[PDB]
């Protein structure tokens, strides 16, 4: 219903052997589409969705440039930060940033955000009012202080409400196709014997996109929540997804046990059974 | 469209 365009920025010092690693990764609707790696030779902004090959040569030149500069900016922030946290010069550290825009169904900025983190803890963030900062600590205070001093909030807000939101549109139109696509899960129930005249029933779900899916096990119409082993959903690398849910059963009583697969691509929730 | 980050130029704890 809503949609979004976020960029994930990573900087990692790899000392004492030189240049930090710079990583930028763009996602529309939580699907990667552009990426930048300081670590390749000929480091450049690459497309990671075919519908993005559609963009000209002058697009990539533009984004690379900015990436290049951003990289240089974090290269020193990494090094500045050690001094402020009285930290040893040998070890490696991590600046991370998430910035982008979620938009409503009415194509309007719904929540804008930009949050930094140093070594996996919060460091500073933009507040919902798009005008103020929250500083995680004494170090981030000085940053916040300068960023107010220089009128940063307004300049980001421009990007956040303007540029970002416009380009989410351009990317969407570009990809209505590949993005709102939908593959229903292929499901089947395996069976394995357990020592004590027990059985394990495993309900499988394979090759589905998008990634959210809920499978459930019941007997006598009641879901068996405190009985299921169930794995985090995982990439086939297709990129479809996989997930399974299993549960212990007495040998013979299996026919009383049903599996249930709720996923947005299938018209009516599946109801499965062995054999 | 990637934004151009401003330098943090921090100091502190």
């Amino acid at each position: 219903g809503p949609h979004s365009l976020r960029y994930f920025v990573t900087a990692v010092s790899r000392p004492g052997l030189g240049e930090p690693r710079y990583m930028e990764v763009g996602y529309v609707d939580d699907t990667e589409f552009v990426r930048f790696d300081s670590d390749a030779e000929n480091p450049r902004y690459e497309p990671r969705a075919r519908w993005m090959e559609q963009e000209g040569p002058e697009y990539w030149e533009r984004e690379t440039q900015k990436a290049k500069g951003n990289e240089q900016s974090f290269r020193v922030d990494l090094r500045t930060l050690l001094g402020c946290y009285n930290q040893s010069k040998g070890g490696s550290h991590t600046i991370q940033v998430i910035s982008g825009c979620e938009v409503g169904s009415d194509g309007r900025l719904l929540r804008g955000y930009q949050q930094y983190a140093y070594d996996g803890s919060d460091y500073i963030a933009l507040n919902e009012d798009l005008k103020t900062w929250t500083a995680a600590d004494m170090a981030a205070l000085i940053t916040k202080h300068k960023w107010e001093q220089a009128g940063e909030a307004e300049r980001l807000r421009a990007y956040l409400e303007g540029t970002c939101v416009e380009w989410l549109r351009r990317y969407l139109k570009n990809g209505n196709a590949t993005l709102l696509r939908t593959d229903s899960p292929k499901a089947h129930v395996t069976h394995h014997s357990r020592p004590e005249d027990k059985v394990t029933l495993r309900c499988w779900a394979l090759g589905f996109y998008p990634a959210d899916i809920t499978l459930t096990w019941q007997l006598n119409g009641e879901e068996l929540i405190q009985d299921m082993e169930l794995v985090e959903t995982r990439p086939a690398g297709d990129g479809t997804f996989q997930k399974w849910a299993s549960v212990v059963v007495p040998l013979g009583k299996e026919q009383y046990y049903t599996c249930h697969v709720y996923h947005q691509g299938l018209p009516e929730p599946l109801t499965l059974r062995w054999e | 469209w990637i934004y151009v980050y401003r330098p943090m130029g921090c100091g502190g704890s």
Partner: T-cell receptor
Amino acid sequence: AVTQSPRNKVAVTGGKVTLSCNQTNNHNNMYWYRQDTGHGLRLIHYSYGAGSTEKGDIPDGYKASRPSQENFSLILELATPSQTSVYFCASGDFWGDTLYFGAGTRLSVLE
Amino acid sequence: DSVTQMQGQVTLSENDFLFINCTYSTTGYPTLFWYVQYSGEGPQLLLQVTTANNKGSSRGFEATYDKGTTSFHLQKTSVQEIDSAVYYCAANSGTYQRFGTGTKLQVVP
């Protein structure tokens, strides 16, 4: 502040020339521009920071080393009279922010 | 990312009102600048604004970020003659900064 060395310079065609720019601002980006009648400020080389050197609009004739964050120098490997001109160095805190310029250097090249 | 300012020379008398023309072509949301370059010297940021539509002022010049026109017209209520200099307009959305020929202002007493 950004300063330029030397400020004035005479050189014979075919010789080597280095203009160095040293910058007290703590800036990553630096640019070398050339300036002359009818064309104004034209970018030659620039540097996102210590290490890199990217070509600008009119690189032929010039090479630029970026040893540290403080120094950016351009080198006319073997000079021509077409490179007689006034040269300007600028620094920049980040990408597309204000530029701070040097006082320029006057370079006449004659055979 | 481009800028066009249609005046090569402009000259006037002191106390005259000054107006120099600026329109830009850009793909992102550029911040906008006026740079001034007093003869003998290198250029210097006269003024900037980052958001439409506000106006910057320095040394008694001003200019408004005119998105509807894509304009950044430099205006001064009473041009003095210290102000004789070359004035450069410029946008920037994260490109590298280039400069036109700008406008050569001669103020005469």
